């Protein structure tokens, strides 16, 4: 048994079995990947995403909790639950607040190849992701779906190179440890790179990324990560087609 | 003014005296730079002029003249 309720669902499910109540929430329903379920719902017009598993909600919940400890901007979780006589085959749920207004970074950079952004805005975004991912990894969380589309740029204010905030989302497969093994670090870095092959990153936008990501001199990175970087460049070539 | 800014950056970047920063000097053999320094130089240029240099252009910046030509 694991259960954490926060507002508004703490009162909403007071004398209620919350595992029943999540199944009773309503709204635009989505993915039904074998027992799993995602749906958007509103409480006083707020908007929350409901993920029910009947792999479970634990992955997202511990990533979200570690990222909050580490100061990495992400979803806020207002409800979470696990129960089951078989600790392997648990019934779980997690409800996260909606982040809005936002535009994810793939959409935002959709057509940088042809509509080039301000250079300083570009480099600030490249670096802001380098910081978050680095921060994520140093805090013991590897994403497993580390793509630019899972980073939200916040549009509640005008966006400039000097003022913008990101949030990382979709942690449904995220693994949380006290230290992120290097193989898992590299998978995220690989995936983040392949998601970004089509936005006009110069060779130097990528070195900028690596420096900020590792927080080590560029010369050391290119030496000690040589094989990783050569592999990523080789995969990225074939993926370009 | 711009024609001088480029000369100043190459010097602050490559750690060479302003007198050695001649339009004929290639960074690699004349100003003691290696590979990466040129790239860090190209980056420093991008950042000082708040611009972006495409990888095709930046690989043609191998001399001081090459550097000034691009900014103008
Ligand atoms: P000399 O010392 O002989 O050689 C010089 C040099 C440049 C070091 C050498 O030739 C070399 O090693 N490579 C040549 C070209 C180059 O610049 N390579 C380095 C960059 S490519 C790389 O390192 C492999 C993968 C890139 C790293 C990942 C990028 C992450 C990007 C994701 C950002 C997300 C944000 C997007 C905004 C919406």
Author numbering:
A (entry chain A): 1 to 54, 73 to 259
B (entry chain B): 2 to 73
The authors write:
Here, we report the first X-ray crystallographic structure of P. aeruginosa WaaP, expressed in Escherichia coli, which revealed a very tight and novel complexation with E. coli acylated acyl-carrier protein (acyl-ACP). However, here we discovered that acyl-ACP acts as a very tightly bound cofactor necessary for the production and stability of active WaaP kinase, uncovering a new function for acyl-ACP. The catalytic core of the protein kinase family was mostly conserved and demonstrated to be essential for WaaP cellular function, suggesting a conserved EPK-like mechanism of ATP dependent phosphotransfer.
The final crystal structure contained a 1:1 complex of P. aeruginosa WaaP and E. coli acyl-ACP. The structural topology of the WaaP kinase consisted of a 6-stranded β-sheet NH-terminal lobe (1-118) flanked by two α-helices (19-24 and 73-89) with strong structural homology to eukaryotic protein kinase (EPK) family members, as expected from primary sequence analysis, and a predominantly helical COOH-terminal lobe (119-263). The density was consistent with a palmitoyl group (C16:0) on ACP. Weaker density matching a phosphopentatheine group extended from S36 in E. coli ACP that positioned the lipid palmitoyl group in the hydrophobic channel of P. aeruginosa WaaP. Structurally, the EPK-family residues required for ATP binding and phosphotransferase were mostly present, however important differences were observed that placed WaaP in the eukaryotic protein kinase-like (ELK) family. Differences from classic EPK structure elements included the novel COOH-terminal sub-domain, a modified Mg2+ binding activation loop where histidine (H168 in WaaP) coordinated to the second Mg2+ ion in place of a conserved asparagine residue (N171 in protein kinase A), and a shortened, structured WaaP activation loop lacking EPK regulatory elements. The WaaP/acyl-ACP interface was composed of two discreet interactions: a ~645 Å2 hydrophilic PPI and the insertion of the lipid chain of acyl-ACP into a ~680 Å2 hydrophobic invagination in the COOH-terminal lobe of WaaP.
